[PDB]
């Protein structure tokens, strides 16, 4: 696709949200329903690497995708968390926010998660 | 003391760094060594209530933060998490962020507490 996230390329299809600076995308595994992605749309691989206003960006919009999926997915909270560097857990090299809906007591395919980017897209 | 941390006040004595927005504190039972917060000033409960800025000077700080205290306490790596809602965890009703440096393979005194505060200023 047209976004670079780490050394794979993401297809817009599966983005919904796109700054001036970062971008969001819906993950081909999410851990819980909702569970999407805000990176910068530079790929830095730690967080220290982000000029500041790319983290101003970075986070205003991890503010406004958290308000759309929590709403969406119906969740009553949510968690955010950035897993930055090796001993941190970070899977892919490139600053991300995992931002999941969360609600009390708690794989698919490409076109199962454009058809979920797609619904995103709305609330925007 | 004079910063505001839900219905708590925080002593000056265990903050070691205050913007124009935001301020960071250290923990009475930190995680892991090094475990810090960084709250807005204005205690807001959920993350969606705060403005731009005051999400962009969060983020910015929590950057400079996380620097110090994976420098300082050793860590490797780093992991932020913010527990956004009482079904995400949420204990105190403040927004903040959770600094916590990490490392391969992994409660005290107020005067604990502003020794490591004092130390954590000397990096600002
Ligand atoms: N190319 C990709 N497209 C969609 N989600 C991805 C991609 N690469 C990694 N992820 C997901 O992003 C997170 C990285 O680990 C997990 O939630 C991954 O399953
Ligand atoms: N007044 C306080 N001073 C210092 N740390 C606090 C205070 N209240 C809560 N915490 C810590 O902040 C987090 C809130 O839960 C935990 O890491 C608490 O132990
Ligand atoms: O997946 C979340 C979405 O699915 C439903 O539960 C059923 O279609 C919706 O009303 C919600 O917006
Ligand atoms: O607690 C972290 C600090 O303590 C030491 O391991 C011993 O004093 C330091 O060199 C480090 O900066």
Same mark, same amino acid.
């Given at each position: 696709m047209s976004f670079r996230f780490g050394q794979h390329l993401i297809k817009p299809? /599966?983005?919904f949200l796109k700054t001036e600076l970062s971008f969001a995308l819906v993950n @081909?595994?999410?851990? /819980?329903?909702?569970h999407v992605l805000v990176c910068p749309?530079?790929?830095?691989? @730690?967080?220290?690497?982000?000029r500041p206003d790319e983290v101003a960006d970075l986070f205003q919009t991890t503010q406004r995708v958290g308000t759309v999926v929590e709403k969406h997915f119906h969740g009553t909270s949510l968690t955010f968390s950035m897993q930055d560097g090796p001993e941190a857990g970070?899977?892919?090299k490139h600053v991300h926010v995992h931002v999941l809906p969360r609600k009390a007591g708690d794989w698919r395919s490409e076109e199962e998660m454009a058809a979920e980017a797609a619904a995103l897209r709305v609330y925007f």
């Open positions: 299809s /599966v983005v @081909r595994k999410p851990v /819980v329903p909702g749309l530079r790929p830095v691989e @730690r967080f220290h690497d982000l970070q899977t892919v």
